[model samples]
Target: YSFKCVNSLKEDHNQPLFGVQFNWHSKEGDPLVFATVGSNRVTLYECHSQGEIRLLQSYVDADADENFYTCAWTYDSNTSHPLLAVAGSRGIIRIINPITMQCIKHYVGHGNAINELKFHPRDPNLLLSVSKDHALRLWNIQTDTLVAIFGGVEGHRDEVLSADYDLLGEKIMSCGMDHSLKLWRINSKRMMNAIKESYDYNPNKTNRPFISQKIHFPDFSTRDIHRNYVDCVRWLGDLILSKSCENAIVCWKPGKMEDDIDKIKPSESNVTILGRFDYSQCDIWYMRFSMDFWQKMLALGNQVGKLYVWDLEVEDPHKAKCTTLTHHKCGAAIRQTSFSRDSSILIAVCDDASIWRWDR
Candidate 1:
């Protein structure tokens, strides 16, 4: 019922904290977590039930040769085992064992700075990463090999900022500095006809069934979607959601254009704007959806640290309403916002090294 400030840490001048993840350790009787801050270090902390925090460990690259930028974690079903994947400026991925706080393996082959990293939900060993090198690389954690390298030669023209795998991990969606959103199949090794026949005409089906099968790509036909860099991409159920630095958010249904297919043409599969706000002088930096609720609520963070929540499921796509929440005092540029697994609380982190929680 009350909010608490457990612990505070100094911000890195060059490598500010870009991402954070919380994991509850039953034996430890608290939450064990990790934060990716700056270029070469990842810090581990423990969160007590009383809202107290302690720095358990600080994992640094002693090599001074390999530097990491972004990080992500993967948890196997039943909460049996969890893995941390960190991407570096050198375009290599370090798979770490969180419990031991050690780097176990590495996934290499990226040409530029690795900007983002995510693990497959169904396949704990599989990882997806994006980089300034203008490519998306999929890796196999078990084999420590690059499963697939997408983007670059036949991919984005500019640096890829974000990439996400849908619930099923069958397909992936990515955005980049080129102001474009690209949808790709995870199982590119599978024959097209074979995949279609196996799913009985449903090309969306892959090895993972609990994940959704609806695959949607951004509709480039919609001029209002993103004119500049696309910062992030998220999956909301069967819908494809994306946000841009240009102050735009788009949601699209993949198979929704079936009826208008012949009239609309192929370029229309890019993305359709569900709702957007110019915010005058404010530039939207990050946005996230609540995972616990059926009704879709999207929270947008701007350059000025103001948070805006919008109802994305309204009937009229263009006339949607938004509510503004002014919580932070500093002109903090929010980098990431995530809803708890229980969906009752929202966490927002910014450049100020402050974490804010919102209870719905």
Candidate 2:
């Protein structure tokens, strides 16, 4: 696909911006919506059919000194409204209603800055957050309670940067600064049951987020693959795409075996690095990449303000044709990107607090 720069807008705050996400499941009549977060604020924008973008509304965290580092959008079944989940420098996650531009509710659990937040693909009530505190916490938004915490004795040894749910929402993939990538198999029944009983029964609640009965550990965790901090990771079907501050994005898959011996700390035989997509000059932390709703195109920005678009229709990802697009005039790093529902419009946010739009 071909693309060209159409519009650009600078945010009021001069601080760096972090994330932008398209409302992938927006209603038919509603205008195409997307949200951006950074520097204690969350802003919603609309993408018109003709390639113009209009700022819809923005909600600033005036009550606290938290900087929002990431955001995820989902339709809230409890409130019957589309809510944007924003979290960052502060470990708290705020659920914002774009229409009213109000924070409907906020969930607090992490002890350090949160790197990313993702809603369960199938369940709108479930939200997953990874943080610098070296843990991944899942929350039930409907009742505002903890579902499960996926880290403890056997977990990422450093800052957890990113995590994503599988298509069925039964599994989770996470990567971290400790140079580790992990795959977790979640028991949805037990997780949902914890939310049903919102109160924690344990007397000692300092270290444990919830009951160990509700917790689940990773089926596979390894730092042997990448030597640098793994910043982003995503599950595409049974295949996995993960990246660090390295020169390439690694496309691989976990070994499917059911042996009781060495289940958690599986050896190198546990994973297969299928292909390494060349990602030169984009070697920086927190510059997250995105695959389109159709999973056909992948886009990521680099430290020098260039965006790379990869066509994933090829037989092997290593051979996928890549197109590099540029627009950031100040040479600021593009931190995040999101593709419209139809994959026609692409929105990119940079460290200079500017948003750029590229239309195919």
Candidate 3:
């Protein structure tokens, strides 16, 4: 691993960076990385191929009272148009044009803090979000309408922490304070038929599975490896990657055969582990798997401000190799890490409001 200090391009007194997204443009053009800070401000940086970064834009929300928590951009055709979606602590969703640095529309339906927001991979018009209000909402960006709300009266009993749409966009998986991961059929607007049938719901007679009925997972008991809040969850091919506040990172692989799948029942099998780091004595904040579907690695961050890299070779699961990278002083508690579009680099963000890029 190598390190360099990129100059702080923006100087917002009250705003602290929360999230960052690197524009997945072609390698020829400098990629634009957007950083969300405070309530209504985003600082954009142009990352050049030569490893130099420069400030490109400073986007401020007109309605600062909306309290922007997160932001994401969408691209169409070859032109990279920016659509910034933000969730407020007040349960409001706002979409803005980062280019003009203005709010285009506001959605005010959720009743709790919007924890996370993501746009669909292929459909720019479709957006997904999770909230402390125990709701997972689907929004139509074109009309700025709440297309669907997954959890609330009929969803999770506790807060929905994190969610992601599978590669095919056919399924949406989410996990929360309840210590259980859920699989939902996106377009079908309901739970999977296999899951419903296992839970005793006859899809033939029922147009929609009762939202009130919790989907049963046979291995739910062993699923909650972390005794505390599960903060970040993501998808890695057919597996699920989760990090908990209790200093644990869990990798879950869905069983293939009926008996093998039944053995885990609801709870996927844990294939990778990043247990507590006694040196830092801090919880793992966030993690991400590599993009290579066949050969993937797990990069994890610790509350004590350290990072660990583990090679996840499923072929020889028991003998997998792991390495820890200690780069931050005072243990920069890493918040998030993502692979570059081409899988040649890894970028990680820390509690210090700084971002680091690691070469693959």
Candidate 4:
């Protein structure tokens, strides 16, 4: 397997570019769209059929003090427009229309910086976000209200770094600086019913962070695997792959067991580690990784500007071949990595505010 640098550019601000993502609308002959979030701006881009990338538009925060650290794209059924949700240092989220480059709605909740944002794969109205406040929140974008709060008891003791919803959006997997990874089941039917009944009465409960009845606890929380902070996590079927500052990515899943926690023996012991991959020079936190559209290829960046791509098409994961591509000259940390919808292009944003592209 091999990759080559095809194009590169830098953001407007000289600050670190924290996140980038491709839209989920991958199909033959469809135009590819993506967005990047950083300092105080969210920029949109398009990749043509001839492999040329063009800057479509950008939305700059007028205040210039709200640094956006992460973003996700989703379709809003009500307005029939694709929305880009960006959040960061100020704990406020801006849902913008990528076409007009205008902020449509603002969401404020998290007490600290929000590290990650994820929209459900099939449910356009649901968004999952994790933050430095040590909480994972599920938001109903349509209603502009919190659907469920997945913290408070048996939650992350430190910052919740990353999270992802499963294929069905019925489950969520998250990792945090507290040296733990958690799996939580979203009771969508119950939550939806509660939301409907609450809105029907039009209660005047605007003073609280979230509705009390919507509070949720994790199905299982485990700190047995990662000895360091687990900063990034993604789902590959029922298995979860997470990365820490320990210079490796561990693939694991919750084991099947009926017995709960005991005195010295914890229920967290019922976790199975499937595989491990070498991700060198990755000591810094919040350096995320990406998997291709087909989940067959995975890529991650290190602090030294080296990008690693693992080909998972092999029979044994232990035999997965990794190809390293190095081009970011100054050794600025690669903050995040993302694959285009068709998996034909891979992009990594750096601490120097530069973007690097790799093609197959």
Off by over 4 Å in 3: 1-11, 14-16, 25-28, 32-34, 62-67, 76-82, 152-154, 187-225, 254-281, 284-295, 313-320, 328-331
- TM-score of every model versus the real structure: 0.74, 0.90, 0.73, 0.89
lDDT string, candidate 3, 297-325, tens digits: 65665665466666665463334456766
Best by TM-score, which number?
Answer: 2
Candidate 2 structure, TM-score to reference: 0.90
lDDT, residue 82, model 1: 70
Candidate 3, TM-score vs. the true structure?
0.73
How would you encode candidate 4's per-residue C-alpha lDDT over 221-293 as one tens digit per residue?
7887789999999887767788899999987777643332221132545776768998789888889998987
Candidate 1 local lDDT, 42-97, one digit each (tens)? 76654444444456665677667656656776754446577677776777677777
- Which residue pairs in candidate 3 have backbone atoms (N, alpha carbon, C) closer than 3 angstroms, thus clashing? 217-266, 304-331, 305-331, 305-332
Q: Could you report the Cα RMSD, in angstroms, for every candidate shown?
A: 7.2, 4.0, 7.1, 3.7
Highest lDDT model number: 2
Judged by whole-model lDDT over C-alpha atoms, candidate 1 comes out at 0.58
Q: Which lDDT value does model 4 have at 287?
A: 92
Model 3 backbone overlap count: 4
Better of 2 and 3 by lDDT: 2
Residue 18 miss distance in model 3 (angstroms) = 2.6
